[PDB]
Amino acid sequence: MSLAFTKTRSTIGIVAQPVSVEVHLSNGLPSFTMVGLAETAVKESKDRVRSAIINSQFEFPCRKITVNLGPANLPKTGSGFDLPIALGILAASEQIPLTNLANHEFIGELALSGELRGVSAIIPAVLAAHKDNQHLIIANANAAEASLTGHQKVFTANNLREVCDYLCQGTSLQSLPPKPDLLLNNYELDWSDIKGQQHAKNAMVIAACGGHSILLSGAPGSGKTMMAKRFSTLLPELSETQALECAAINSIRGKLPDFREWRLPPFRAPHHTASPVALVGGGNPPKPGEISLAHHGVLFLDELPEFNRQVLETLREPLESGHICISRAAAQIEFPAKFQLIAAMNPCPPDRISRYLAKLSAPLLDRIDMQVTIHALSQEELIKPNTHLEKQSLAIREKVTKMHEIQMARQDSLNANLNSKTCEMVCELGSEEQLFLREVMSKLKLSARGYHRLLKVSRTIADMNSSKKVLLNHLQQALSYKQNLH
Amino acid sequence: MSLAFTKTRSTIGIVAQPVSVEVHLSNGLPSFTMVGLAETAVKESKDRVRSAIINSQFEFPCRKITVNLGPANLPKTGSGFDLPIALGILAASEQIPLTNLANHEFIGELALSGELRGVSAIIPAVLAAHKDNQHLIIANANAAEASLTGHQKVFTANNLREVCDYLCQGTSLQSLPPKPDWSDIKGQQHAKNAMVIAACGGHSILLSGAPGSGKTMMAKRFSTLLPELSETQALECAAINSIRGKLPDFREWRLPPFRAPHHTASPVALVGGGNPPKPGEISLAHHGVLFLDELPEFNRQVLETLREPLESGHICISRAAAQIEFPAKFQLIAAMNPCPPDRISRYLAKLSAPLLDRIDMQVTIHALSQEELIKPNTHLEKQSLAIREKVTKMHEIQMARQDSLNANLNSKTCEMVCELGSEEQLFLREVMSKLKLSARGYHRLLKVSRTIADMNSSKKVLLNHLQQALSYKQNLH
Amino acid sequence: MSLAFTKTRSTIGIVAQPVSVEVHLSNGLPSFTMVGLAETAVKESKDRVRSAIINSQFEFPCRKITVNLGPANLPKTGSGFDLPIALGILAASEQIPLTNLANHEFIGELALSGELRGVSAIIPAVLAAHKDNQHLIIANANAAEASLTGHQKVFTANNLREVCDYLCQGTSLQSLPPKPDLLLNNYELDWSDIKGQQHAKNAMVIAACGGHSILLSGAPGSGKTMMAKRFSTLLPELSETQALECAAINSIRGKLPDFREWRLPPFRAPHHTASPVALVGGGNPPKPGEISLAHHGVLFLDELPEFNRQVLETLREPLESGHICISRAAAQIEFPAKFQLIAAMNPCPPDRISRYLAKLSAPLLDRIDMQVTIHALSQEELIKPNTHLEKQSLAIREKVTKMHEIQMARQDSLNANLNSKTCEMVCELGSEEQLFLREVMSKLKLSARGYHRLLKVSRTIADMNSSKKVLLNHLQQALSYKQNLH
Amino acid sequence: LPDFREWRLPPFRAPHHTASPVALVGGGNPPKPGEISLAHHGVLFLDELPEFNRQVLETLREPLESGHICISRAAAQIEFPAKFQLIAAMNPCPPDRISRYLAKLSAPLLDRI
C-alpha cells in the first residue's frame, strides 16, 4: 500500500495557482483514470507519461493508477503536469525516496522518449516558487528564460532519469546559466553627469528619496529626458520579489519580452500618442499596459499635455490603489501598477496660453506633488566637458535607502502617500512654523490639496537633515517647488 | 439493511439549498453509478472517494454502489459532496453506526490521502446549518472563514479518520478557533450637519461642488456614522462576501460595507453576474453605503436597472432555469459638479434619468476658507461615538413608530405621521408658491422634515423644522 | 530500441511551426493510441497509415503503437502528417535506418495504395524548411506549387517505397521543376489613364515616394478608385525576401496563379459593408483577413465614414507595427500586415455637417499624413484625347526606387516610419525655415502631431526636389496638402 | 406561491423597458411562461411605451386579439394563455422633434389601445 504527493503550478495568467498531484495504486485491473477537471491537453498525458517511464528503464506499475489534480474546483489549463505525474507514479512505486519530494516543485513536459520539453509561461511559476521558498525543477529548454530571474535556487534537467538521479544520488543537475554580465556597466548614466541645473538635480534627489511625483518644465533640449533616464539610478536596488514581479509582468507580453538587461528598476516612457489599450489594460485578452511595466519603477509621461485626458483620468486609479483591475467581461485581473510618476511639460510662448493649458488634466495635475523649472544652458556653455565629475552616486543611493527606512519606521507609507491625519500628526508644526504658513498662504491663495502637498514636501526636506521636527527653513526651501504655471 | 442517509448543502446564490445524498448497496457486479443532475466535478468524485476510503484503512465495498444526491431536479455543482458520499458509503456498509449521524451535516472535498480539503464559499452553508439546527463538520482549511460566526456545533476535522472515530467512539473533534474616522473635515459646517441627519434617517444624499474639495473624503467618512450591523446582518454580509472568495480583514465585519464603483460601469460587474451568478458591486454594499462617484458619468442603463433594488431592496437575476434574489439593501450617495448657457444646459440634461429626482436630500459644498485650513488638530476630541449613539437611538425610535425608516415611508404613512398642523399648513402654501415642487418632491421634503423633527426629539413637526429642511432641497438649477 | 523520431512542419497563420513526431512500440495488446491535439489525424490518419505500410510490402507492427505529435499545447490540423507517422513507425520497427533521418523533414498524405497525394498549403513549410536548413521531402503533386520557391534540397517522391529507397539506398529521388520565369510585362492600367489631375498625380507620386498614408477627398467621379488601382504599379518590385512571404500569406486562403505578377505588390479594396471577421482575422483554425493580403502592398478604403467603428479601431495596431497578434484566447497569431494605406471620402453633403464629421474616426485620422482634394475634370481638358503613349509609369517607379534606396542608405526606416526625434535630427531646418514655420503654425491651429506630419511631408518633397536640405520653398509647397475640413 | 390569502386578487405586472424579448414573451429552450403571461386575467402596465423595441410591440398584437401567445421551438408548438388588460404611459418632450419622437410609437399596438 503506497501513495505519492507531488506539487506543481498552473499558470493561468499572472497568478500561479498551486496544484497538488496525487497518485494511488489500487490492486485492481490496470486502468489509468484522471480527475480534477483535466482538459484534453492534460487528460492525454496518460500515454506520453507511460512511454516516458518505460523508455527511461523504470518499471511501470501493472496496477490501477488513480491520479487527482487538486483542487477539483479549478480546471487545469496547463500542459506541464506530465513530469509531476510521472514522478508521482515513480514515488508511489517506491522507486524514488519520498522524503526529498516534500521540498520540491516540478514543472515539465516529456516527449515519448522520456526527454524533457520546455513549456510556456514559466516566469510566474518561478516567482511563485521563490515566494513559497520551494526548490523548482524545470525542463532545460526554459533555462534561457529562467536565467533573467537571477536565481540561485532553480534546477534544470534534460531527461527524467537525470531528475531521478538528482533525487537519489544527488547529481545536482545543470543549473541555470551565468549572470548576464554582457552589458554596459553603470547603465551608462550612474550620476554626477548633467553639468548644469544644480537646483533641478537636488529637487530630483529629494523627490527620489521620498515618493513624490515631480513634473518637469523647461525649453526643448535643456533637460527633461536626460534627467528622467538618470533618475532610475537613484532608486534603491530591487529585492528578489520586486525583480521577479517585474519579470512576471514582462513575460505575459510573449516571446523573450526584452533582453535589455535586468534587475534595475524599470523605466518606461510611452509616447504621447500611443493607445488606451497599450498604456492601460489588455483589451480582449488579459495583457498589462505600459502603466504596469513601470511597477516598482518610474512612469515618464513624456510631453504630458499632449496625452489624452481620459487616460490621465484612468491613471488616478492605480497610482493610489496599487493595482488596476480590468473589468472587461465576466471576469477581471489585478495587474499591480504602483510606480513613481514623472512628467514633462513645455510652457510654450494672450488667449493662446489659456486655450492651450485648458487641455491639462486638472485632476492629475493636482495629484502631481512636485514641480520645477528647467532653464536652457545656451549653445555657449555646453562646449566645456565634465571636468572631474568625481562620481558619488553610492552615497546618494545609500541616503535613499536610509530615508526609506526612516519612513518605514513611522509607517509603511512614504511621505507622498500620507493621508491628511497621518501627515498632520507627523509634522510637529510648531507655533512659528504655523505663523509662517499662515503668512505665506495669506500671500499665496492655495487650496486644500496645495496646502497638504506643501506639508508633505516640507516634511520630506525636514527628513533630508535628520530633524525630528520641521523648521521654518525646511518649509521655506520646500516652497520653491510649487506655484504651478503663471 | 444496506441503505444510508447523509445530509449536506449545495450553494446557488446566497441560499444553501438542502441536499440529501443517498447510498444503496446492491448485490450485483461491482460498479459506481451516480444519479441526479451533477456537474462533472461532482461525478468525478467516484475515484476521490474510493481512494480516500482505501487510504483511511476502511474496506471499500465490492458491491453495486448507487449514489442519489437529491432532489433530482436541482443541479449539483459544488465540489464538497466527497465527504457526504464517503460517510454515506461507510454508513451503508455498517462500518459506522447510522444513528450517530442523524442531526449532522458534512461538507468537504477529499484528497487521495483522506485529508479534508477546504471548499470555496462555505459561509452560506454554515448559516443554513445553524438555522436548521444541525451540526456541521467541515474541513480544517475552512476554519478561518467559518471563524466569523462564533457558532458552536461547527466542529472541524483534518482527515476522515478523525470523523470516523468521532462518530464511532465519540472522540472530540477540534472546536472552531475563537475570533482574533469622522475626525478632520475642517470647518465644512453645513455639509456634515446635513450628512448627520442623512445617516439618522437613512436618506439618499447628493453632494454638489467642485471636485477635490472633500467630497470623497466625507463620503468615505460617512461609513462610520451608521450603526454597527446586528449579528444576523453581519452574518448575511459575510455570506455575500464569501461568494467572491475572500474574508481577509476581521475587526471590521460589524461595520457597514463601503463600495465606490468606477464610472466605467460594466453592467455584469456592477450589477448581477453571468454564468453561475456572482454578487455585483451593488450587492456588496448590502446594509452599507453605495457611493456613485461622478454620477453624471454613469451610463443610463446600469442606473436604470439600479432604480428597482433601490425601491425594493433586492435585484432579481436569473438563468434560463433558475431564479436568484441576491439581496441588495443599501444607502445611496452621489456627487455632481455645478459647472461654470447651452453648455451647462446640455450638462444638466445629460444627467442620469429620474434616479436623481428621487434622491432624498441635496447639499452644496463650499470651498474651505484658509484660516480654518490652518487650524491644527488640537480640536481632536472624539465625535464619531456620540453621533453613532444618536443614530442608534434614532433608528430605535423610528422602528418603534413603524417598521421602516423615514426614507422608506409609503405615500399614506408619511402624511399620517407628519401631522402638519394648521400653523405649518399656513406656511407650506407660500413656498409652494415660490417653488413648483412635484408630489414626490413634497413627500421627500416631508420625510426630511420628519427626520429633523426627530433630531430635535420632537413628538410633532414644527414650522422651524420645515424651514430648516427646505435648505436641503432644490436639486439642480 | 522501439523508439523513433521524425520532424515535420505544421502551420497556423503564416508561421510553419516545427513538429516532432514520436512513435513508440509496446508489447501490449494491438492498438493505435495517437496523442497530441489532432482534429483529423487522430481519427483518420491511423487508418490510412496502416494500409500504406501494409500494401508497400513492409511489415506492419503487431504491437501497441503510441504516436505523439510534438508540442501537446499546439492544436494541429494539416492533413500531411501521414507520411511522418508512417516513417516513424517504420524506423521504430527498424525497417528503415533511423540514423538517416537526422537532417530531413517530411510532408504529405498517403493514399491506401502507398502513393503520396498533394497536400494543401505547402509554401510556408518550404520556407520554414529552408530557413531551418532542412531537407524537405514532399508529395509529387506539390512540385508545381513548391517550385516558385526554387530552393535546392527539395525532393518530390511518388510513393512511400521511393522515400524508403532514398533513405536506405540514397538514390537521387527527384529534382524540382525547372524554375518558371516571370519576364515581367505589366500590359495593363498604367499611370497615363489619369487625365488632367495634375495636383492629385504629383501628390500621389510623392506619397508613394515617402510611403505616407494618403486620404483622397472631393466630388465623386473624379477618379478616386482609379488612383488607388493605378497606385500599385508605382511601388518597387518585391524581392524574394518579400515575395515568398506574400506568396505564403496568399496560399493560406487558396490557389496561387500569380506566376507572372508574382513579384508585383498586391492590392486590396474591400467594400465598407464587409464583416470584421473576414476583413481582419478569421474563424475556424485561424485564416487571414482582407487586411493581411495587402502585406508589403497597398490597402484602399473608400467610403471611410461608413465603416463600422470596430474595424477602424482595430486597424491601429497593424498600421503601427505591421502585425495584429489576433487571438482566440487559446493562442495568438501574429499575422503580419505591413501595408501602405490609402483612404477616400466625400467631404459632407446645418448640424448634419457636425454629425458627419463626428462619425469620422479620429484615432485613424491622427496618422493620416497626406490629404488632397480632387475636383471633377474640366470640360476643355476632357475634350483632348491621350495623344501620347510614353509609359511614364516606369520612370515614376524608377524615381520611387531611387528615393527608397537613398532613404534606406539613411536610417533604417522611410519618412513615413520616422518618429518625432528621428524626424527632428533628419532635417536641418535653418533659422528662416523655423521662424516661417512657427508663423504659419500661428496663423492656423495645427497641433504638434500635425507639425511633425508637415515636417515629414516637407522632407519627402525636398528629397524629391533633389535638395540636400529642406528649404522654406518646400514648406510652402507642403502646406497646400493640409487644412482638413472647413 | 405567495398564496392562500391574496391569490384571488387579479395579477399585476409592470415589466421594465429593458427586459428581453425571450423573458417578456415565451421562454427559451425549456418553455416557461413569459412576463406577459403573468398578467393573465389581470393588468399589464407598460410605462414609457416608446422606449420598447419594435419586435416585441409587433408580437404584442397576437395575444391582444387571440388571448394567447404561441411559442414555437421548431420541434413543437406550445400555447401560453395571455388574455390581459393593457395600461400604457408616454410623455412628450420639448419642435418637429416631437413629431419624429411620436413617430417611434408602434402603429398597430397604438390603434389597439
Ligand SMILES: Nc1ncnc2c1ncn2[C@@H]1O[C@H](COP(=O)(O)OP(=O)(O)NP(=O)(O)O)[C@@H](O)[C@H]1O
Ligand atoms: N475639509 C477637509 N478637511 C481635511 N482635508 C480635506 C478637506 N477637504 C478636502 N481635503 C483633502 O482633500 C483630499 C481628498 O479630496 P476629495 O475630493 O474628497 O478626494 P478626491 O479623490 O479628490 N475626489 P475627486 O475630486 O473626484 O478626485 C485629501 O487630501 C483630504 O485631506
